[PDB]
Design a protein around this ligand. Structure first.
Ligand SMILES: *[C@@H]1O[C@H](CO)[C@@H](O[C@@H]2O[C@H](CO)[C@@H](O[C@@H]3O[C@H](CO[C@H]4O[C@H](CO)[C@@H](O)[C@H](O[C@H]5O[C@H](CO)[C@@H](O)[C@H](O)[C@@H]5O[C@H]5O[C@H](CO)[C@@H](O)[C@H](O)[C@@H]5O)[C@@H]4O)[C@@H](O)[C@H](O[C@H]4O[C@H](CO)[C@@H](O)[C@H](O)[C@@H]4O[C@H]4O[C@H](CO)[C@@H](O)[C@H](O)[C@@H]4O)[C@@H]3O)[C@H](O)[C@H]2NC(C)=O)[C@H](O)[C@H]1NC(C)=O
Ligand SMILES: Cc1nnn(Cc2cc(C(F)(F)F)ccc2CCC(=O)N2CCC(CSc3ccc(S(N)(=O)=O)cc3F)CC2)n1
Ligand SMILES: [Ca+2]
Ligand SMILES: [Cl-]
Ligand SMILES: [K+]
Ligand code: NA
Ligand SMILES: [Zn+2]
Length: 804
């Protein structure tokens, strides 16, 4: 019930929301069917439209007009945005040269530069170049301010997950808005774009910027706008709020446009019908800037122009149907489109089997345009698993395609030519970022970055302490002139032991053998030196990683590599080695094929054993430092230490051997040396965070050797590739991966072929940020470089994406 017979007189676009049954006058009242009877009349005036003309200049104030051209309008805060242009011979903001804004130039009574977020739905990154002729206001912001060539959205590249990620700094799995449609089995409730359940606050986790602001005494405009409020009125409302007295006036605001998404869906991303929506967004930006200039705020306000996601060409004829694969197609519920999510139709069906559905969808047709995954097998970079609303079965749909249950779903629901929602590495899904204002840099290009980082920066812009989030605070300091947040490196929690030779060979009963019985004082002192770390500067280029949790581990030095060996997990946490451009690849000698050697620095009881691998018929073993890249025949024996061994499924060894034998050398040739850090990851509860021992769900049969869910590598070199990796004086270049440790290669449809036709494609799919590896391992990398910490943070957030 709403008692709609109250009034909005003096309350239009009120900031405090009032409780039912009292009638409302705020931004969102329309969307709740709760506005007072007179809201249209009083708050949505349209008479005479939105622009002053010469003949209105100095008019007698008429309160019926949408906006005003009378002499009192500036003091009332309600001039048409062009008032001073038409009636006082001022220039439009876009016609003025840009001038660096070195300090905020604010009216008296402003305590901080306000922040205005101009958000645009479906604004694909390439519009900045391809639409530039029709967007002069946006182009001036972009060239005069700070801009990235694009900004990476989160997966799925849908509207609600991305807007709320922008507002919270959180991954959808953590904020809870995991799609445009959702089922929550604990609630037993359904969330959709149409209708009322979505207004219940229980869906919306984390803490959005407007709540952060309000809890810390910074006032906020309401961010949301009901669709029938025209854009011109949204701008006027923002500008009116900015004329409020100091104690009432917000410091943070948001504008939102449904365009160009709305048109992009109908006409496709570059349909000729798209020039007009882009023109109109630009005009809106011009209105805001001219309005701010009127208020003498155009060199005071920080403005962010930001998109939620891009838009791709998709048509009804590019739909895959699950009825062409499954027999039982009515025993499932599919959330469909540019992604697929599958669950049982009825929780009273014990004949539901996910395993059989996965097999029925896996590599069934030769050009298949989707790939099924159990959610825990999705690429870790998507961070799309740790939520009860994300269904166990997921379909990653190829760009330009849809998935649907049956053809009848597609014609009893071609209309559309555009859609989005695909993998967030896809070029067509990328979106835009521009920052303009006193606190942003002047005419500065910055590298592409992920939208999860922006919440921290918006908090910095407003002097707020961010709530706990998935940004890496400091990684975007290079966007800012001032207000930088000065992060410190985390403190190492566990210090390593440095074991010397403490055990005789015969103390070991590991059931391992090696043909290594081959006896010189010149080379005897030398090998001692290598074991004490004489080559460590070569192989550990950026310091040892720091261990940020409580544990027991040893540093082990060797000629060709250094490792941090966990007494708890019985294997290295990390293994570091450097491969120069000139290094040679060799084979494992025939005599050493099954060689595993006890490590006399590490007790039998904190060692793996070969017998467990023999008895475990599913599980084999591999090595972290590759025997193929040994620097000499003698150094090669170090690679067969039991302390360099890790459990590997035979199917995974095909991948790992190819990486170690072929790809490491290839990268060293291309990048002029590389430093590699590799290791295991345990994430059995798929939360993106390092498992404790008591969370491990699988061990090598008969043992306490835990089985990794993934293996990582971090591959670093000099950004200036004319310098070798091991003598780089400037910034670094990194690529990383987190490969799933799987017993089959069902993910790779071409895996019966040679590794050269499929392994690298797999690795590219599982590309990662260093930061992703940090969360999964409790390690902190790049602790000792010549680089500034903010720059290192930026490097740790880089994702190598493999798009053109
Ligand atoms: C990205 O950034 C985010 C934010 O920093 C990271 O997520 C955080 O990670 C922490 C570790 O997983 C986690 O900390 C736990 O929080 C518990 C309290 O949680 C509530 O209160 C906070 C505070 O305001 C709130 O934010 C939470 O919000 C979640 O849940 C609500 C619904 O209830 C949702 O609206 C919201 O979207 C959010 O859901 C997401 O997170 C939850 C986990 O909380 C997931 O389950 C969801 O799927 C979704 O992803 C909560 O309202 C706290 O109780 C925990 O403490 C337990 O563990 C410690 C270990 O030391 C133990 O000693 C304690 O005894 C305790 O255990 C007891 O309970 C167990 C569970 O029932 C039980 O089994 C035991 O036997 C014990 O009885 C813990 O501190 C933090 O909440 C989330 N925050 C958010 C916002 O998601 C995220 O990790 C980052 N991602 C990456 C990749 O880095
Ligand atoms: C989704 C979403 N997430 N965050 N925003 C705000 C936002 C963030 C940013 C940002 F700065 F973050 F970039 C910029 C701009 C916005 C405004 C977006 C907006 O007016 N749109 C149109 C209105 C539509 C109503 S739907 C709705 C409302 C309230 C609630 S409630 N009761 O508050 O839980 C629930 C709802 F489902 C949502 C999307 N929208
Ligand atoms: Ca985990
Ligand atoms: Cl969805
Ligand atoms: K075995
Ligand atoms: Na396969
Ligand atoms: Zn859309």
């Amino acid at each position: 019930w709403t008692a709609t017979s109250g009034s909005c007189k003096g309350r239009c676009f009120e900031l405090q929301e009032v409780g039912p049954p009292d009638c409302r006058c705020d931004n969102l009242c329309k969307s709740y069917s709760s506005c007072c009877h007179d809201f249209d009349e009083l708050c949505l005036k349209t008479a005479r439209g939105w622009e002053c003309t010469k003949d209105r200049c100095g008019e007698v104030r008429n309160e019926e007009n949408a906006c005003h051209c009378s002499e009192d309008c500036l003091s009332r805060g309600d001039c048409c945005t062009n008032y001073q242009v038409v009636c006082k011979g001022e220039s439009h903001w876009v016609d003025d040269d840009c001038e660096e804004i070195k300090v905020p130039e604010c009216p008296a009574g402003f305590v901080r530069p306000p922040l205005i977020i101009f958000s645009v739905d479906g604004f694909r990154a390439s519009y900045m170049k391809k639409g530039s002729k029709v967007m002069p206001n946006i182009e001036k912001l972009r060239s005069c301010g700070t801009h990235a060539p694009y900004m990476r959205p989160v997966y799925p590249t849908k509207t609600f997950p991305n807007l709320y990620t922008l507002a919270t700094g959180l991954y959808p799995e953590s904020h809870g808005i995991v799609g445009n449609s959702m089922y929550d089995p604990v609630f037993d409730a359904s969330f959709h774009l149409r209708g009322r359940e979505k207004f219940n606050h229980r869906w919306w986790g984390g803490q959005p910027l407007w709540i952060t602001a309000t809890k810390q005494g910074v006032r906020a405009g309401t961010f949301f706008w009901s669709v029938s409020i025209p854009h011109e009125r949204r701008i006027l409302t923002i500008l009116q709020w900015l004329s409020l007295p100091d104690n009432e006036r917000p410091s943070v605001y948001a504008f939102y446009s449904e365009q160009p998404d709305f048109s992009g869906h109908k006409y496709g991303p570059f349909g000729p019908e798209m020039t007009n929506p882009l023109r109109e967004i630009d005009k809106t930006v011009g209105q805001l800037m001219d309005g701010l200039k009127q208020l003498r705020l155009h060199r005071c306000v920080n403005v962010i122009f930001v998109g939620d996601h891009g838009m791709e060409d998709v048509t009804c004829d590019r739909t895959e149907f699950l009825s062409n694969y499954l027999t039982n197609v009515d025993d499932i519920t599919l959330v469909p489109g540019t992604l697929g999510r599958i669950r049982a139709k009825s929780i009273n069906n014990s004949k539901y089997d996910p395993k059989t559905i996965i097999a029925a969808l896996t590599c069934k047709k030769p050009d298949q345009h989707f790939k099924p995954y159990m959610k825990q097998h999705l690429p870790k970079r998507l961070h799309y698993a740790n939520n009860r609303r994300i269904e166990d079965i997921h379909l990653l749909v190829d760009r330009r395609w849809h998935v649907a249950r049956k053809p009848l779903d597609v014609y009893k629901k071609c209309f559309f030519q555009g859609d989005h929602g695909f993998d967030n590495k896809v070029n067509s899904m990328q979106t835009v970022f521009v920052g303009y204002g006193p606190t942003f840099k002047y005419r500065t290009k910055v590298p592409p970055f992920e939208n999860i980082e922006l919440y921290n920066v918006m908090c910095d812009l407003l002097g707020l302490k961010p709530a706990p989030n998935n940004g890496t605070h400091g990684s975007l300091n290079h966007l800012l002139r001032t207000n930088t947040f000065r992060p410190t490196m985390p403190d190492e929690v566990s210090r390593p032991n440095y074991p010397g030779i403490m055990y005789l060979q015969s103390e070991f009963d590991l059931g391992c053998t090696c043909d290594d019985k081959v006896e010189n004082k010149l080379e005897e002192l030398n090998k001692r030196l290598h074991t004490k770390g004489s080559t460590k500067e070569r192989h550990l280029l950026y310091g040892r990683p720091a261990v940020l949790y409580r544990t027991s581990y040893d540093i082990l030095y060797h000629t060709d590599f250094e490792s941090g060996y966990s007494e708890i997990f019985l294997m290295p946490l990390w293994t570091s080695y450097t491969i120069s451009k000139q290094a040679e690849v060799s084979s494992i000698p025939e005599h050493l094929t099954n060689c595993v050697r006890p490590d006399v620095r590490v007790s039998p009881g904190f060692s793996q054993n070969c017998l467990a691998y023999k008895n475990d018929k599913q599980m084999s073993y591999g090595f972290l430092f590759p025997p193929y890249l040994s620097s000499s025949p003698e150094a090669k024996y170090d690679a067969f230490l039991v302390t360099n061994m890790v459990p590997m499924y035979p199917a995974f060894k095909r991948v790992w051997a190819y990486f170690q034998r072929v790809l490491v050398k290839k990268y060293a040739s291309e990048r002029n040396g590389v430093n590699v850090i590799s290791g295991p990851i345990f994430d059995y509860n798929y939360d993106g965070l390092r498992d404790t021992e008591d969370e491990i769900k699988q061990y090598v049969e008969g043992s306490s050797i835990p089985v990794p869910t993934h293996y990582y590598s971090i591959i670093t070199s000099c950004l200036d590739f004319t310098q070798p990796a091991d003598k780089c004086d400037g910034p670094l270049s990194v690529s990383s991966f987190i490969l799933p440790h799987r017993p089959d290669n069902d993910e790779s449809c071409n895996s019966s072929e040679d590794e050269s036709k499929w392994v690298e494609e797999l690795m590219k799919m599982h590309t990662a940020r260093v930061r992703d590896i940090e969360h999964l391992t409790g390690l902190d990398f790049y602790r000792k470089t010549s680089r500034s910490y903010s720059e290192i943070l930026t490097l740790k957030t880089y994702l190598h994406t493999y798009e053109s």
